[PDB]
């Protein structure tokens, strides 16, 4: 019985780390690196997901650019993030109920796992929507800041890690369900 | 001559990350129908058209159809791009 329990706690643990990555996406230090040096003209952009820093140091609260439709795309994006977080928390809650039974059941864990799935899916869709808004903003030539890099922000990679971890927890708690 | 990259040119790496992850998301659902079993079966799904053995509809077999449609589209677009 130690096996199923240790794998289960391992699963809620991976879910927890995944929540930390979700916060990490919601708390990126700066979304992507950037520069404009075409003298005079010399710049070092460090755009955030919301707070577009630049570097003396100069963080800036741009937020919500890209005119037509795209603002609504951001709406669906953030809402999808919220429901994402909600399904995460529901996952922790149901799994902690299993912990209450560790202190249906399997049907309930299957439920929470399904919520992890819906969370991961809606989340991947969300990140898609956001990358779409970003590439569109760069496509419109963001006011002045059109960095030659912007290549990637590691926190997003961490969001993808949160995804694969939720996937990993669902499948393994279901592996316990297979027993 | 590019090494490796030249094959990778027609479609962006990020798009590859997307198709991979999305494939994972597809992969779990087949097991949801039932941590590796039907995941391995999904590995047996991408390899060939899409999915199998489902006793009429069941559930994720329709996911198999959608996935077939999906990979069909992407490979088509890929080939067109290289062309």
């Amino acid at each position: 019985k130690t096996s199923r329990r240790g794998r289960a706690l391992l699963a809620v643990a991976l879910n927890l780390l995944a929540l930390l990555f979700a916060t990490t996406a919601f708390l990126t230090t700066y979304w992507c690196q950037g520069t404009q040096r075409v003298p005079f003209q010399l710049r070092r952009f460090h755009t955030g997901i919301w707070y577009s820093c630049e570097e003396g140091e100069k963080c800036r609260s741009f937020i919500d650019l890209a005119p037509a439709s795209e603002k609504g795309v951001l709406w669906l994006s953030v809402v999808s993030e919220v429901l994402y977080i909600l399904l995460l928390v529901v996952g922790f809650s149901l799994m902690c109920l299993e912990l209450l039974h560790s202190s249906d059941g399997l049907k309930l864990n299957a439920f929470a796992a399904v919520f992890t799935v819906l969370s991961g899916l809606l989340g991947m869709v969300a990140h898609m929507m956001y990358t779409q808004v970003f590439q569109v903003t760069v496509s419109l030539g963001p006011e002045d800041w059109r960095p030659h890099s912007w290549d990637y922000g590691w926190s997003f990679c961490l969001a993808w890690g949160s995804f694969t971890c939720c996937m990993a927890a669902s499948v393994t708690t279901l592996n316990s369900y297979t027993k | 001559k590019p090494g490796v990259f030249s094959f990778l040119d027609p479609l962006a790496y990020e798009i590859w990350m997307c198709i991979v992850f999305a494939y994972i998301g597809v992969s779990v659902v087949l097991f949801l129908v039932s941590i590796f079993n039907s995941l391995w079966f999904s590995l047996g799904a991408f390899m060939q058209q899409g999915c199998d053995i489902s006793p009429r509809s069941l559930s994720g077999r329709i996911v198999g159809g959608v996935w077939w449609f999906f990979t069909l589209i992407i490979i088509s677009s890929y080939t067109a791009n290289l062309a």
Partner: peptide, 29 residues
């Protein structure tokens, strides 16, 4: 990525729909 991203959207939508079918099928029993 976008032009295919829409296909990602129909894909995920199909996923959620099929999961719903799985749910009601779990409801019959």
């Amino acid at each position: 990525l976008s032009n295919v991203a829409g296909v990602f959207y129909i894909l995920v939508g199909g996923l959620g729909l099929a999961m719903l079918v799985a749910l009601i099928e779990f409801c019959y029993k």
